[PDB]
């Protein structure tokens with residue numbers, strides 16, 4: 001089933017600003033519902049060990065999301081991963097980046113353990129999330145944006161708004 005609305009994915013390393021940006025979109029743009037996928041994964045135990053996610057866990061998540069994604073209205077999906085989702089769902093994929101100094105501080109203030117913080121810092125340096133998104137979706141719908149400041153966030157949301165209007 002083809003989506004009835006406009007669907008956006010916001011992805012990027014933990015701490016890059018996905019949830020913040022998705023909530024800005026849901027607040028500022030017309031008719032967007034935010035799906036915080038990490039919360040779905042927790043709430044529904046869509047994982048094997050919230051850590052290890054196996055093939056079957058992905059399948060169950062997708063079955064849960066499918067009816068939402070094809071429903072009327074617009075959706076802004078927020079998740080650190082992207083390869084798992086069908087290209088059918090999305091009209092835009094936004095990948096957020098953050099400078100290492102800014103990211104480190106966010107991860108500290110948000111209280112990640114030192115190991116998880118370092119793991120996430122390395123993932124950002126290695127461009128894991130961006131490479132995944134570019135491998136999984138058509139290059140023309142992928143927007144990559146530096147997201148260090150609130151001014152940057154707002155400008156990105158303006159670019160999204162412009163792109164959405166075109167799609168609409």
Ligand SMILES: Nc1ncnc2c1ncn2[C@@H]1O[C@H](COP(=O)(O)OP(=O)(O)O)[C@@H](O)[C@H]1O
Nearest residue numbers: 014015016017018019020106147148149150153
């Ligand atoms: N563009 C931005 N400019 C400044 N601070 C930001 C920005 N985006 C996010 N933040 C800060 O980083 C914190 C964590 O961001 P969050 O949206 O939770 O990231 P993610 O969902 O990618 O893990 C926010 O609570 C806020 O303090």
Ligand SMILES: [Br-]
Nearest residue numbers: 029030161164
């Ligand atoms: Br809009």
Ligand SMILES: [Br-]
Nearest residue numbers: 034035036039
């Ligand atoms: Br949600």
Ligand SMILES: [Br-]
Nearest residue numbers: 038078079080
């Ligand atoms: Br997430």
Ligand SMILES: [Br-]
Nearest residue numbers: 148149150151
């Ligand atoms: Br700022």
Ligand SMILES: [Mn+2]
Nearest residue numbers: 018019020078
């Ligand atoms: Mn988040």
Ligand SMILES: [Mn+2]
Nearest residue numbers: 023034035036
């Ligand atoms: Mn929300």
Ligand SMILES: [Mn+2]
Nearest residue numbers: 038041050053
């Ligand atoms: Mn997860």
Ligand SMILES: [Mn+2]
Nearest residue numbers: 055056058059
């Ligand atoms: Mn599968």
Ligand SMILES: [Mn+2]
Nearest residue numbers: 068071072073
């Ligand atoms: Mn809907």
Ligand SMILES: [Mn+2]
Nearest residue numbers: 112113114115
């Ligand atoms: Mn510790």
Ligand SMILES: [Mn+2]
Nearest residue numbers: 014112116120
């Ligand atoms: Mn983490």
Ligand SMILES: [Mn+2]
Nearest residue numbers: 087135136137
């Ligand atoms: Mn693909």
Ligand code: NA
Nearest residue numbers: 083132135136
């Ligand atoms: Na791959």
Ligand code: NA
Nearest residue numbers: 131134135136
């Ligand atoms: Na590749």
